[PDB]
Amino acid sequence: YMLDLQPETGGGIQRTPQIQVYSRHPPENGKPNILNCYVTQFHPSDIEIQMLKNGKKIPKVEMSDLSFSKDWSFYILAHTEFTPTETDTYACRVKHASMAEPKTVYWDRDGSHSMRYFFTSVSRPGRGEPRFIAVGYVDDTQFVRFDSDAASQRMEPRAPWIEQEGPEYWDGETRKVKAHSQTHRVDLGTLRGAYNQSEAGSHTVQRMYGCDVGSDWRFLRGYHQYAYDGKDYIALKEDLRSWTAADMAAQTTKHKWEAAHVAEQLRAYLEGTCVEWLRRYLENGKETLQRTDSPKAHVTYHPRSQVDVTLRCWALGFYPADITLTWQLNGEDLTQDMELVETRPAGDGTFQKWAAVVVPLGKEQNYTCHVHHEGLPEPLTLRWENLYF
């Protein structure tokens, strides 16, 4: 349930995509599966993602709705059905303005809750109104979307439990999401003026807001923050009464919103309405939302040099996405030379992660992987049982 308040900011750089290519389920030759291409850390949001089989474009590839993480960097999941074999190669190819050439990555085998909305507007001077994309989450489960270039021109369901809501709900959310788009359109215009930028270039406004509740479903935290061209602009501080302005232009907005008492209006939504609707969603989506799936963990071996080995600690099938995955040598922990990938979606309501370390041969028993997750009664501790080396 979105905010009705629409404050305006007032009148007076590229990052490279990271790519993971991986299957939803453990890969077995001849068994139907889903291949994922998880593309993250990119800016601006305009991007082309293609999945390839033996170098040829796979035609039926589904893309997630554009969203972004805390640092404002975008992410998209692309996925397609596939049945792996011994000989077929698979890859994901990304074109983005940050890179001179496309990057191709081949598939290689060996108690709290939150509601959050994420909004992205991208100007396109001479080509109509900004591209506007909105997505809503409860915890790590997306439940609504809006895309200005989609056909419906309505807020749309993306989870079965929200489809219960009647037409009044959908009408209200559609009205509000369109109002968000217009506010962002205005913001793009005035921010362009504030930074003395030309009317020709494309620019980006991102906005995130929402609430966390505790184990008793009482208000825990609120958020309401903005970025311009992928950089912090203004953010509501944790007290929900003051602002962090990132530069001089944002200070003008800060003083404007201070004068108009915008923080107190947002506080009322964040501590009241946001929380009340989160509780409703948690009850309506109980089976899928009020759940913890524990990480299914194991350690794999991979020969490296004649002197050492790579040990990789896997965590699979877990929900929610928050997890701590760490290696420890002889009790003491250290992330000096630990490779750690971003937590990635399986595409079926669970997440995956791994952490890898290079261990000298003979000293493998000294290394232990530790998995902490709210689903686990006790933290898991794993070691590589050396059978066949």
GROMACS .gro file of C-alpha atoms in nm, residues 18-27 33-40 51 75-80 82 90-92 105-109 314 316 341-348 350-354:
model
   49
   18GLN     CA    1   2.841  -0.800  -1.282
   19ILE     CA    2   2.699  -1.127  -1.415
   20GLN     CA    3   2.629  -1.468  -1.259
   21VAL     CA    4   2.514  -1.756  -1.481
   22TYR     CA    5   2.376  -2.057  -1.294
   23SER     CA    6   2.095  -2.314  -1.284
   24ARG     CA    7   1.795  -2.299  -1.050
   25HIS     CA    8   1.831  -2.669  -0.959
   26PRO     CA    9   2.149  -2.882  -0.935
   27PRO     CA   10   2.249  -2.949  -1.297
   33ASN     CA   11   1.602  -2.715  -1.535
   34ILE     CA   12   1.602  -2.333  -1.540
   35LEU     CA   13   1.910  -2.129  -1.640
   36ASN     CA   14   1.947  -1.792  -1.467
   37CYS     CA   15   2.150  -1.486  -1.564
   38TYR     CA   16   2.165  -1.252  -1.266
   39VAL     CA   17   2.295  -0.911  -1.372
   40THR     CA   18   2.379  -0.664  -1.096
   51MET     CA   19   2.100  -1.573  -2.320
   75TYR     CA   20   1.959  -0.574  -1.076
   76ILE     CA   21   1.769  -0.792  -1.322
   77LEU     CA   22   1.721  -1.169  -1.334
   78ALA     CA   23   1.690  -1.321  -1.680
   79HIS     CA   24   1.587  -1.686  -1.704
   80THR     CA   25   1.494  -1.958  -1.950
   82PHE     CA   26   1.683  -2.560  -2.045
   90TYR     CA   27   2.522  -2.180  -2.251
   91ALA     CA   28   2.605  -1.817  -2.195
   92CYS     CA   29   2.466  -1.480  -2.103
  105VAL     CA   30   2.979  -1.507  -1.942
  106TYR     CA   31   2.955  -1.881  -2.009
  107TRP     CA   32   2.770  -2.118  -1.779
  108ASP     CA   33   3.031  -2.307  -1.571
  109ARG     CA   34   2.922  -2.603  -1.350
  314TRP     CA   35   2.747  -2.358  -0.079
  316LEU     CA   36   2.109  -2.328  -0.131
  341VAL     CA   37   2.952  -1.396  -0.452
  342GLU     CA   38   2.645  -1.180  -0.418
  343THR     CA   39   2.339  -1.363  -0.290
  344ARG     CA   40   2.140  -1.463  -0.596
  345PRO     CA   41   1.780  -1.572  -0.658
  346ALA     CA   42   1.701  -1.930  -0.763
  347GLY     CA   43   1.379  -1.795  -0.915
  348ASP     CA   44   1.147  -2.021  -0.708
  350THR     CA   45   1.467  -1.917  -0.249
  351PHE     CA   46   1.822  -1.787  -0.268
  352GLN     CA   47   2.174  -1.918  -0.316
  353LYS     CA   48   2.521  -1.810  -0.213
  354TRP     CA   49   2.874  -1.944  -0.199
   0.00000   0.00000   0.00000
